[PDB]
Coordinates of N, CA, C and O in Angstrom, one line a residue:
Chain A
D1 N -119.2 9.1 -25.8 CA -118.3 10.2 -25.1 C -117.4 11.2 -25.5 O -116.6 10.6 -26.5
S2 N -117.4 12.2 -25.8 CA -116.4 13.1 -26.6 C -115.9 14.4 -25.9 O -116.7 15.1 -25.3
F3 N -114.8 14.4 -26.3 CA -113.6 15.7 -25.5 C -112.5 15.7 -26.4 O -112.0 15.1 -26.9
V4 N -111.6 16.7 -25.8 CA -110.3 17.0 -25.8 C -109.3 16.9 -24.6 O -109.8 17.5 -24.0
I5 N -108.2 16.1 -25.2 CA -107.3 16.7 -23.8 C -105.9 16.5 -24.8 O -105.9 17.2 -26.2
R6 N -104.6 16.5 -23.9 CA -103.4 16.3 -24.9 C -102.9 14.8 -24.7 O -103.2 14.0 -24.0
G7 N -101.6 14.7 -25.6 CA -101.4 13.3 -25.8 C -100.9 12.8 -24.7 O -101.1 11.7 -24.4
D8 N -100.2 13.5 -23.8 CA -99.5 13.0 -22.6 C -100.8 12.4 -21.6 O -100.3 11.7 -20.7
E9 N -101.8 12.8 -21.5 CA -102.9 12.2 -20.8 C -103.9 11.3 -21.7 O -104.9 10.6 -20.8
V10 N -103.6 11.1 -22.7 CA -104.6 9.7 -23.5 C -104.2 8.4 -22.6 O -105.0 7.3 -22.6
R11 N -103.0 8.3 -22.0 CA -102.9 7.1 -21.2 C -103.7 7.0 -19.9 O -104.0 6.0 -19.1
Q12 N -104.5 8.0 -19.8 CA -105.6 8.1 -18.2 C -106.8 7.5 -18.9 O -107.4 7.3 -18.2
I13 N -106.7 7.5 -19.9 CA -108.2 6.9 -20.7 C -108.3 5.5 -20.8 O -108.1 5.0 -21.9
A14 N -108.4 5.0 -19.9 CA -108.3 3.5 -19.5 C -109.0 2.8 -18.3 O -108.9 3.5 -17.4
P15 N -109.4 1.8 -18.3 CA -110.3 1.2 -16.9 C -109.2 0.9 -16.0 O -108.0 0.6 -16.1
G16 N -109.5 1.6 -14.9 CA -108.2 1.3 -13.8 C -107.5 2.0 -13.2 O -106.3 1.6 -13.3
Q17 N -107.5 3.1 -14.2 CA -106.5 4.3 -14.2 C -106.8 5.6 -13.4 O -107.9 5.7 -12.7
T18 N -105.5 6.3 -12.9 CA -105.8 7.5 -12.2 C -105.2 8.5 -12.4 O -104.1 8.6 -13.4
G19 N -105.4 9.9 -12.2 CA -104.9 11.2 -12.9 C -105.8 12.2 -12.5 O -106.5 12.2 -12.5
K20 N -105.3 13.3 -13.2 CA -106.2 14.3 -13.1 C -107.2 13.8 -14.2 O -108.3 14.4 -13.6
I21 N -107.2 13.6 -15.2 CA -108.0 13.4 -16.1 C -109.0 12.3 -15.6 O -110.4 12.4 -15.5
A22 N -108.4 11.3 -15.3 CA -109.1 10.2 -14.9 C -110.2 10.2 -13.5 O -111.1 9.9 -13.3
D23 N -109.4 10.8 -12.6 CA -110.0 11.1 -11.1 C -110.7 12.4 -11.3 O -112.0 12.5 -10.7
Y24 N -110.8 13.4 -12.3 CA -111.2 14.9 -11.8 C -112.1 14.8 -13.0 O -112.8 16.1 -13.0
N25 N -112.1 14.3 -14.3 CA -112.4 14.8 -15.5 C -113.4 13.7 -16.0 O -114.4 13.9 -16.6
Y26 N -112.8 12.7 -16.5 CA -113.5 11.5 -16.9 C -113.0 10.0 -16.2 O -112.0 9.9 -16.6
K27 N -113.5 9.2 -15.5 CA -113.6 8.2 -14.9 C -114.3 7.1 -15.7 O -115.8 7.0 -15.9
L28 N -113.7 6.0 -16.1 CA -113.9 4.7 -16.8 C -114.2 3.7 -15.7 O -113.3 3.3 -14.7
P29 N -115.2 2.9 -15.8 CA -115.4 1.9 -14.7 C -114.5 0.7 -14.8 O -113.7 0.7 -15.9
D30 N -114.2 -0.2 -14.0 CA -113.2 -1.1 -13.7 C -114.0 -2.3 -14.9 O -113.2 -2.9 -16.0
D31 N -114.8 -2.6 -15.0 CA -115.7 -3.5 -16.1 C -116.1 -2.9 -17.2 O -117.5 -3.0 -17.7
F32 N -115.5 -1.6 -17.6 CA -116.0 -1.1 -18.7 C -116.1 -2.0 -20.2 O -114.7 -2.6 -20.4
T33 N -116.8 -2.1 -20.6 CA -116.6 -2.9 -22.0 C -117.2 -1.9 -23.3 O -118.3 -1.3 -23.5
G34 N -116.4 -1.4 -24.0 CA -116.3 -1.0 -24.9 C -115.0 -0.3 -25.7 O -114.1 -1.3 -25.8
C35 N -114.9 1.0 -26.4 CA -113.7 1.1 -27.5 C -113.4 2.7 -26.8 O -114.3 3.5 -26.6
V36 N -112.0 2.8 -27.0 CA -111.4 4.2 -26.8 C -110.8 4.8 -28.3 O -109.9 4.0 -28.5
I37 N -111.2 5.9 -29.0 CA -110.9 6.1 -30.0 C -110.3 7.7 -30.0 O -110.7 8.3 -29.2
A38 N -109.0 8.0 -30.7 CA -108.5 9.1 -30.2 C -107.7 9.5 -31.5 O -107.1 8.7 -32.1
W39 N -107.6 10.7 -31.6 CA -106.9 11.1 -32.9 C -106.1 12.6 -32.9 O -106.9 13.5 -31.8
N40 N -104.8 12.6 -33.6 CA -104.5 14.0 -33.4 C -105.1 15.5 -33.8 O -105.2 15.3 -35.1
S41 N -105.6 16.3 -33.3 CA -106.1 17.5 -33.8 C -105.5 19.0 -33.4 O -105.8 19.7 -33.1
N42 N -104.1 18.7 -33.9 CA -103.5 19.7 -33.9 C -103.9 20.9 -34.9 O -103.8 22.2 -34.5
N43 N -104.0 20.4 -36.1 CA -104.3 21.8 -37.3 C -105.8 22.4 -36.8 O -106.2 23.3 -37.3
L44 N -106.6 21.6 -36.0 CA -108.1 22.3 -35.7 C -107.7 23.0 -34.3 O -108.6 23.8 -34.3
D45 N -107.8 22.3 -33.2 CA -107.9 22.8 -31.9 C -106.7 23.4 -31.4 O -106.7 23.6 -30.3
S46 N -105.4 23.8 -32.0 CA -104.3 24.4 -31.6 C -104.3 25.8 -31.9 O -104.8 25.8 -33.5
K47 N -103.9 26.8 -31.3 CA -103.8 27.9 -31.9 C -102.5 28.5 -31.5 O -101.9 28.6 -30.4
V48 N -101.8 29.5 -32.4 CA -100.7 30.2 -31.8 C -100.9 31.2 -31.0 O -101.9 31.7 -30.9
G49 N -100.3 31.0 -29.8 CA -100.0 31.7 -28.4 C -100.8 30.9 -27.4 O -101.0 31.4 -26.3
Chain M
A1 N -76.3 11.0 -15.5 CA -75.2 10.3 -15.7 C -75.6 9.5 -17.0 O -76.7 9.2 -17.3
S2 N -74.3 8.9 -17.6 CA -74.6 8.0 -19.0 C -75.3 6.7 -18.5 O -75.0 6.6 -17.2
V3 N -75.5 6.4 -19.6 CA -76.3 4.7 -19.3 C -75.6 3.7 -18.7 O -75.8 2.8 -17.6
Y4 N -74.6 3.9 -19.4 CA -73.1 2.6 -18.9 C -73.0 2.7 -17.1 O -72.6 2.0 -16.6
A5 N -72.9 4.2 -17.0 CA -72.2 4.6 -15.5 C -74.0 5.3 -14.6 O -73.8 6.4 -14.2
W6 N -74.6 4.6 -14.6 CA -76.2 4.7 -13.9 C -75.6 4.7 -12.2 O -75.0 4.6 -11.9
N7 N -76.1 6.4 -12.1 CA -75.9 7.0 -10.8 C -77.3 6.2 -9.8 O -78.4 5.9 -10.4
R8 N -76.6 5.7 -8.2 CA -77.7 5.2 -7.5 C -77.8 5.7 -6.3 O -76.7 6.4 -5.7
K9 N -78.8 6.5 -6.0 CA -79.0 7.4 -4.9 C -80.0 6.5 -3.8 O -81.2 5.8 -4.1
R10 N -79.4 6.4 -2.5 CA -80.4 5.8 -1.6 C -81.2 6.6 -1.0 O -81.1 7.8 -0.6
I11 N -82.5 6.3 -0.9 CA -83.6 7.3 -0.3 C -84.4 6.5 1.1 O -84.8 5.4 1.0
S12 N -84.2 7.5 2.1 CA -84.5 6.8 3.1 C -85.0 7.9 4.3 O -84.5 9.0 4.2
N13 N -85.6 7.6 5.2 CA -86.1 8.3 6.7 C -86.7 9.7 6.3 O -86.7 11.2 6.2
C14 N -87.6 9.3 4.8 CA -88.3 10.6 4.1 C -89.8 10.1 3.4 O -89.6 9.0 2.8
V15 N -90.9 10.9 3.9 CA -92.1 10.9 3.4 C -92.0 11.2 1.9 O -91.6 12.3 1.6
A16 N -92.6 10.6 1.0 CA -92.9 10.8 -0.2 C -94.3 10.6 -0.9 O -94.9 9.4 -0.1
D17 N -94.7 11.2 -1.8 CA -96.0 11.2 -2.5 C -95.8 11.3 -4.0 O -95.9 11.8 -4.6
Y18 N -96.0 9.9 -4.1 CA -95.7 9.2 -5.4 C -97.0 9.3 -6.4 O -97.0 9.2 -7.8
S19 N -98.2 10.2 -6.0 CA -99.2 10.7 -6.5 C -99.3 11.9 -7.5 O -99.7 11.9 -8.4
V20 N -98.2 12.8 -7.0 CA -98.2 13.9 -7.8 C -97.1 13.8 -9.0 O -96.9 14.4 -10.1
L21 N -96.1 12.5 -9.0 CA -95.6 12.2 -10.0 C -96.3 11.3 -11.0 O -96.1 11.5 -12.3
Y22 N -97.2 10.4 -10.6 CA -97.9 9.6 -11.8 C -99.0 10.5 -12.3 O -99.2 10.2 -13.6
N23 N -99.4 11.7 -11.7 CA -100.3 12.6 -12.0 C -99.6 13.5 -12.9 O -100.5 14.4 -13.6
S24 N -98.3 13.5 -13.3 CA -97.7 14.8 -14.0 C -97.5 14.1 -15.4 O -96.7 12.8 -15.8
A25 N -98.0 15.0 -16.3 CA -97.6 14.7 -17.8 C -96.1 15.0 -18.3 O -95.8 14.6 -19.2
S26 N -95.1 15.6 -17.6 CA -94.1 15.5 -17.9 C -93.1 14.3 -17.9 O -92.4 14.3 -18.8
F27 N -93.8 13.0 -17.4 CA -92.9 12.2 -17.3 C -93.4 11.3 -18.3 O -94.7 10.7 -18.5
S28 N -92.8 11.0 -19.6 CA -93.4 10.4 -20.6 C -93.3 8.8 -20.7 O -94.5 8.5 -21.2
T29 N -93.1 8.1 -19.7 CA -93.2 6.5 -19.2 C -93.2 6.8 -17.7 O -92.5 7.3 -16.8
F30 N -94.3 5.9 -17.2 CA -94.1 5.6 -15.8 C -95.1 4.1 -15.8 O -96.4 4.1 -15.8
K31 N -93.9 3.2 -15.3 CA -94.6 1.8 -15.7 C -94.1 0.9 -14.3 O -92.6 1.4 -14.5
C32 N -94.9 0.4 -13.5 CA -94.7 -0.5 -12.6 C -94.5 -1.8 -12.6 O -95.5 -1.8 -13.4
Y33 N -94.1 -2.7 -12.0 CA -93.9 -4.3 -12.0 C -94.0 -4.4 -10.7 O -93.2 -4.3 -9.7
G34 N -95.0 -5.5 -10.4 CA -95.1 -6.1 -9.0 C -95.6 -5.0 -8.2 O -96.4 -5.8 -7.4
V35 N -96.1 -3.9 -8.2 CA -97.0 -3.3 -7.8 C -97.6 -2.1 -8.4 O -96.9 -1.3 -9.4
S36 N -99.1 -1.7 -7.9 CA -99.6 -0.9 -9.2 C -98.9 0.5 -8.7 O -99.0 0.9 -7.5
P37 N -98.8 1.3 -10.1 CA -98.7 2.7 -9.8 C -99.6 3.6 -9.3 O -99.2 4.7 -8.5
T38 N -100.9 3.3 -9.2 CA -101.9 4.1 -8.5 C -101.9 3.7 -7.1 O -101.9 4.8 -6.6
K39 N -102.0 2.4 -6.5 CA -101.8 2.3 -5.2 C -100.4 2.2 -4.9 O -99.7 1.4 -4.8
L40 N -100.0 3.5 -4.4 CA -98.6 3.6 -4.0 C -98.6 4.2 -2.7 O -97.3 4.2 -1.7
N41 N -99.7 5.3 -2.3 CA -99.6 6.0 -0.9 C -99.9 5.1 0.3 O -99.3 5.7 1.2
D42 N -100.5 4.2 0.0 CA -100.7 3.2 1.3 C -99.1 2.6 1.5 O -99.0 2.5 2.8
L43 N -98.5 2.1 0.5 CA -97.1 1.3 0.9 C -96.3 1.9 1.9 O -96.4 3.1 1.5
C44 N -95.9 0.9 2.5 CA -94.6 1.5 3.5 C -93.0 0.9 3.2 O -93.7 -0.6 3.1
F45 N -92.2 1.5 2.6 CA -90.8 1.1 2.3 C -89.9 1.0 3.2 O -89.9 1.9 4.0
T46 N -89.1 0.0 2.9 CA -88.1 0.0 4.0 C -86.7 0.2 3.4 O -85.6 0.5 3.9
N47 N -86.2 0.2 1.7 CA -84.8 0.3 1.5 C -85.4 0.8 -0.2 O -86.1 0.1 -0.7
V48 N -85.2 2.1 -0.6 CA -85.7 2.5 -1.9 C -84.4 3.2 -2.3 O -83.1 3.8 -1.8
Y49 N -84.1 2.6 -3.6 CA -83.1 3.1 -4.7 C -83.5 4.0 -5.8 O -84.6 3.1 -6.2
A50 N -82.7 4.9 -6.3 CA -82.9 5.5 -7.4 C -81.9 5.4 -8.3 O -80.6 6.3 -8.2
Chain W
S1 N -98.7 -48.7 22.3 CA -98.8 -48.9 21.1 C -100.2 -49.9 20.9 O -100.6 -50.0 19.8
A2 N -100.8 -50.5 22.1 CA -102.1 -51.1 21.9 C -103.0 -50.6 21.3 O -103.5 -51.5 20.5
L3 N -103.1 -49.2 21.2 CA -104.1 -48.7 20.8 C -104.0 -48.1 19.5 O -104.7 -47.0 19.1
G4 N -103.2 -48.3 18.9 CA -102.5 -47.5 17.8 C -103.4 -47.5 16.5 O -103.8 -46.5 15.9
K5 N -104.3 -48.5 16.4 CA -105.5 -48.3 15.2 C -106.3 -47.2 15.5 O -106.9 -46.6 14.6
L6 N -106.4 -46.7 16.9 CA -107.3 -45.6 17.0 C -106.3 -44.3 17.0 O -106.4 -43.3 16.5
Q7 N -105.2 -44.5 17.6 CA -104.5 -43.1 17.7 C -103.9 -42.9 16.3 O -104.2 -41.7 15.7
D8 N -103.6 -44.0 15.4 CA -103.6 -43.6 13.9 C -104.7 -42.5 13.4 O -104.5 -41.4 12.5
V9 N -105.4 -43.6 13.6 CA -106.7 -42.4 12.9 C -106.7 -41.0 13.4 O -107.0 -40.2 12.5
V10 N -106.5 -40.7 14.7 CA -106.7 -39.5 14.9 C -105.6 -38.5 14.5 O -105.8 -37.5 14.0
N11 N -104.4 -39.4 14.3 CA -103.3 -38.7 13.8 C -103.7 -38.2 12.2 O -103.4 -37.1 11.8
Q12 N -104.2 -39.1 11.7 CA -104.7 -38.9 10.1 C -105.4 -37.7 10.2 O -105.1 -36.8 9.2
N13 N -106.3 -37.4 11.3 CA -107.1 -36.3 11.0 C -106.2 -35.2 11.1 O -106.5 -34.4 10.4
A14 N -105.9 -35.3 12.2 CA -104.9 -33.9 12.5 C -103.9 -33.6 11.4 O -103.8 -32.7 11.1
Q15 N -103.4 -35.0 11.0 CA -102.2 -34.6 9.8 C -103.1 -34.1 8.6 O -102.8 -32.8 8.1
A16 N -104.4 -34.4 8.1 CA -104.9 -33.8 7.0 C -104.9 -32.2 7.5 O -105.0 -31.3 6.6
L17 N -105.6 -31.7 8.8 CA -105.5 -30.6 8.7 C -104.5 -29.6 8.8 O -104.7 -28.9 8.2
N18 N -103.5 -30.5 9.2 CA -102.2 -29.6 9.3 C -101.8 -29.6 7.8 O -101.6 -27.9 7.1
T19 N -102.1 -30.4 7.1 CA -101.9 -30.3 5.7 C -102.3 -28.9 5.1 O -102.0 -28.2 4.2
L20 N -103.7 -29.1 5.4 CA -104.6 -28.1 4.9 C -104.0 -26.6 5.3 O -104.3 -25.8 4.8
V21 N -103.6 -26.7 6.5 CA -103.3 -25.5 7.2 C -102.1 -25.0 6.1 O -101.8 -23.9 5.6
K22 N -101.1 -25.9 6.2 CA -99.9 -25.4 5.5 C -100.3 -25.1 4.0 O -99.2 -24.2 3.4
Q23 N -101.7 -25.8 3.5 CA -101.8 -25.2 2.1 C -101.8 -23.8 2.2 O -102.0 -23.0 1.1
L24 N -102.2 -23.2 2.8 CA -102.3 -21.6 2.8 C -101.3 -20.6 2.7 O -101.5 -19.7 2.3
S25 N -100.0 -21.6 2.6 CA -98.9 -20.9 2.7 C -98.2 -20.7 1.0 O -97.0 -20.0 0.6
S26 N -99.1 -21.4 0.2 CA -98.6 -21.7 -1.0 C -99.1 -20.6 -1.7 O -100.2 -20.2 -1.6
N27 N -98.2 -20.3 -3.2 CA -98.3 -19.1 -3.9 C -99.6 -19.5 -4.8 O -100.2 -18.9 -5.4
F28 N -99.2 -21.0 -5.5 CA -100.1 -21.3 -6.7 C -100.0 -20.5 -8.0 O -100.5 -20.4 -9.0
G29 N -98.8 -19.9 -7.9 CA -98.1 -18.9 -9.0 C -98.3 -17.7 -8.9 O -98.5 -16.5 -9.4
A30 N -99.2 -17.0 -7.6 CA -99.3 -15.8 -7.1 C -98.1 -15.0 -6.8 O -97.6 -15.7 -6.6
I31 N -98.1 -13.8 -6.8 CA -97.0 -12.9 -6.2 C -96.8 -13.1 -4.9 O -95.8 -13.1 -4.4
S32 N -98.0 -13.5 -4.2 CA -97.5 -13.8 -2.8 C -98.8 -14.7 -2.1 O -100.0 -14.6 -2.9
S33 N -98.7 -15.5 -0.9 CA -99.8 -16.3 -0.3 C -100.5 -15.3 0.4 O -101.4 -15.9 0.9
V34 N -100.1 -14.3 0.7 CA -100.8 -13.4 1.5 C -101.7 -12.6 0.7 O -101.6 -11.9 0.0
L35 N -102.8 -13.0 0.9 CA -104.0 -12.2 0.1 C -104.2 -10.8 0.4 O -104.5 -9.9 -0.4
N36 N -103.8 -10.3 2.0 CA -103.8 -8.9 1.9 C -102.8 -8.0 1.2 O -102.8 -6.9 1.2
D37 N -101.7 -8.8 1.3 CA -100.5 -8.0 0.5 C -100.6 -8.0 -0.8 O -100.2 -7.0 -1.5
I38 N -101.6 -8.9 -1.4 CA -101.9 -8.3 -3.0 C -102.9 -7.5 -2.7 O -103.1 -6.6 -4.0
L39 N -103.9 -7.3 -1.9 CA -104.9 -6.5 -2.0 C -104.4 -4.9 -2.0 O -104.9 -4.1 -2.7
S40 N -103.4 -4.9 -1.1 CA -102.7 -3.5 -0.9 C -101.9 -3.1 -1.8 O -101.3 -2.0 -1.9
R41 N -101.4 -3.8 -3.1 CA -100.5 -3.7 -3.5 C -101.3 -3.5 -5.6 O -100.7 -2.5 -6.1
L42 N -102.0 -4.2 -5.8 CA -102.3 -4.5 -7.1 C -103.7 -3.7 -7.3 O -104.6 -3.7 -6.3
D43 N -103.7 -2.9 -8.5 CA -105.4 -2.7 -9.1 C -106.0 -4.1 -9.3 O -105.5 -4.8 -9.6
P44 N -107.4 -3.5 -9.3 CA -108.3 -4.8 -10.0 C -107.6 -5.6 -11.0 O -107.6 -6.9 -10.9
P45 N -107.3 -4.8 -12.1 CA -106.9 -5.5 -13.2 C -106.0 -7.0 -13.1 O -105.7 -7.7 -13.8
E46 N -105.2 -6.5 -12.0 CA -104.5 -7.4 -11.7 C -104.2 -8.3 -10.6 O -104.0 -9.3 -10.0
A47 N -104.8 -7.5 -9.6 CA -105.4 -8.1 -8.4 C -106.1 -9.3 -8.5 O -106.4 -10.1 -7.7
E48 N -107.1 -9.1 -9.4 CA -108.1 -9.9 -9.4 C -107.6 -11.2 -10.2 O -108.2 -12.4 -9.8
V49 N -106.7 -11.2 -10.7 CA -106.0 -12.5 -11.5 C -105.3 -12.8 -10.5 O -105.5 -14.4 -10.7

């Protein structure tokens, strides 16, 4: 699963979490067995303005 | 206030919704001990200090 | 006291049950002896523990 968020929201990508992203965008199960990888994409996905 | 002179405010006789605070990216740190930050709306409190 | 040999047996069984009932008040390391107070306060990742 791939997507883009902002850094302050990375804490929501974890099992048993709640928030705008976890509740309304992307929810991980409590028994999730896997990995979460994230990297800063400022040079690619950020635009002036 | 300064950290050595930390200010304490008593909060009572008021309903509050800690779900709009945990869902806020403005707060760089939101960590709770002894009670989950998610399950907060059900809990009923008798003495709140800030 | 003539029938103590039987009354003590009754008392022993009552005492055992009372001890078992008292055992419900123990924490065993948990934050609370009350299961409902744990369930209403902790997320699965900690409530399960």
